[PDB]
């Protein structure tokens, strides 16, 4: 019964205790304010930041590590575009990504089981809803 809450607990703690704790990671903590970076949204069409990922986790957006990791990757790809691949901002984004992968590997077996159990439950609840409607 608590599989989504347990899955989201793991990912949120990766974000707050690992990824946010990367030194000098503040540029990625919150969405960019165009009063501080005026051309940002002229260049980045698909913005992402760690606060937005935490809100997504709190609403149980992610049911797999792949979908979480798509947003984490978007932070790195956006830094490569906006700042260049050799900018210090990109080097800090790349550390955020690597600490996320290394921390996730600490929970590999447990997250593999949670993703299967969350899928099994969603499939069962879908079939129930379909049968209740036809009847």
Ligand X SMILES: C=CCCn1cc(-c2cccc(C(=O)N(C)C)c2)c2cc[nH]c2c1=O
Which residue in this structure is represented by tokens 């590997």?
A: 105
115-124 b/e (C-beta count within 10 Å ≥ 16 → b): beebeeeeee
89 binds ligand X, rule: CB under 6 A: yes
83 binds ligand X, rule: CB under 6 A: yes
Judged on CB neighbours under 10 Å (0-12, 13-18, 19+), 75 is: buried
Looking at the Cβ atoms of 39 and 135, the one nearer to ligand X is: 39
Binding string to ligand X for residues 46 to 65, with x set by CB under 6 A, is what?
A: ---x----------------
Cα angle for residues 32, 37, 40 (degrees, 5° grid) = 70
Selected range binding ligand X among 6-14, 79-87, 108-116, 125-133, rule: CB under 6 A: 79-87
Do residues 56 and 71 lie in contact, with contact meaning Cβ atoms separated by under 8 Å?
yes
Least distance to ligand X, CB of residue 50, Å: 7
CA 60 to chain CA mean position, Å: 11
Return the residue of 6, 20, 37, 77 that touches ligand X, per CB under 6 A. Answer: 37
69 binds ligand X, rule: CB under 6 A: no
Please give the residue ranges that form the binding site for ligand X (CB under 6 A). Answer: 27-28, 30, 32-33, 36-37, 49, 79, 82-83, 89
């Amino acid at each position: 019964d608590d599989d989504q809450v347990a899955f989201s607990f793991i990912l949120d703690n990766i974000v707050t205790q690992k990824m946010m704790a990367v030194p000098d990671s503040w540029p990625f903590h919150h969405p960019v304010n165009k009063k501080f970076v005026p051309d940002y949204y002229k260049v980045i069409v698909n913005p992402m930041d760690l606060e937005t990922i935490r809100k997504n986790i709190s609403k149980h957006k992610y049911q797999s590590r792949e979908s979480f990791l798509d947003d984490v990757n978007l932070i790195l790809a956006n830094s490569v575009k906006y700042n260049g691949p050799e900018s210090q901002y990109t080097k800090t984004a790349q550390e955020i990504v690597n600490v996320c992968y290394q921390t996730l590997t600490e929970y590999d077996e447990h997250l593999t089981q949670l993703e299967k159990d969350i899928c099994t439950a969603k499939e069962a609840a879908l079939e129930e809803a379909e049968l209740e409607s036809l009847d």
